[PDB]
Design a protein around this ligand. Structure first.
Ligand SMILES: C[C@@H](c1cccc2c(-c3ccc(CS(C)(=O)=O)c(Cl)c3)c(C(=O)O)[nH]c12)n1cc(CCCN)nn1
Ligand SMILES: [Zn+2]
Ligand SMILES: [Zn+2]
Length: 232
């Protein structure tokens, strides 16, 4: 009823949207992984009379439910999607999107890693993002490669019209006590990558983590703090 939805409030298979700003929503879904249930976020950005989707809803059935929720709540077609790294919470559901007429995109690095991992593979490569600090425009957002953090390929997304910073899994929520799933992470480089985000987007008003509650710029420093403590 208006608060940001939490893991115990979303059954696996259902998707909720949350209005972040004019023409900006997050999407929240839940999924089981290795015997535990986790929430995950993505983003929806209005692109005229179309929508840009950032990240799947972590699975084929969740992503079908995401498209149905968008049709119910927004009623504009999703025409393009960007996956911000290669894990299943970002690309799982790309096949559903592709069969629904959505053009799917990711960096070449993400596409290679997804293919090697056995995950679904976005169709189109996003060039111009291979060096840390790189940025490119994509419809109503800017895509930014901060360097290795949660994964080597992780991208962040900025919505300039609303000063919304979607950090993806490179950014953790304020309640986080550990660096999450670090199997593919670079803990030594992650603080430097967060510092690049902080320097590039100093006017961000909302920061959305890959999992958990949005907040302000403090999520960036908190993330650096938890990652440094974990690495130790
Ligand atoms: C598919 C993905 C994946 C699966 C399950 C959980 C997570 C989390 C996460 C996120 C937050 C917390 C709480 S917190 C910050 O710790 O307090 C935790 Cl516990 C965990 C993250 C994230 O952090 O983005 N991602 C998750 N996934 C798979 C793989 C390797 C697969 C190899 N076969 N790597 N990630
Ligand atoms: Zn991940
Ligand atoms: Zn994640």
């Amino acid at each position: 009823s208006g608060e940001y939805p939490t893991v115990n409030e979303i059954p696996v298979g259902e998707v909720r949207l949350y209005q972040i700003a004019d023409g900006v929503w997050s999407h929240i879904a839940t999924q089981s992984f290795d015997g535990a249930v986790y929430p995950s976020n993505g983003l929806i950005v209005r692109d005229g009379d179309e929508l840009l989707l950032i990240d799947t809803a972590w699975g084929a059935k969740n992503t079908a439910a995401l498209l149905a929720e968008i049709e119910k709540q927004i009623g504009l077609p999703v025409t393009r999607a960007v996956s911000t790294h290669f894990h299943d919470d970002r690309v799982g559901g790309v096949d559903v999107l592709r069969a629904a007429g959505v053009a799917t995109y990711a960096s070449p690095s993400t596409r290679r890693l997804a293919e090697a991992e056995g995950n679904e593979i976005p169709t189109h490569s996003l060039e111009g993002l291979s060096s840390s600090g790189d940025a490119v425009r994509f419809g109503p957002v800017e895509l930014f490669y901060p360097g290795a953090a949660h994964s080597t390929d992780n991208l962040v997304v900025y919505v300039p019209s609303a000063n919304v910073l979607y950090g993806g899994c490179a950014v953790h929520e304020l309640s986080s006590t550990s660096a999450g799933n670090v199997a593919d992470a670079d803990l030594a480089e992650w603080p430097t990558s967060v510092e690049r985000i902080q320097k590039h987007y100093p006017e961000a008003e909302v920061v959305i983590p890959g999992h958990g509650l949005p907040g302000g710029l403090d999520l960036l420093q908190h993330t650096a703090n938890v990652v440094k403590a974990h690495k130790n």
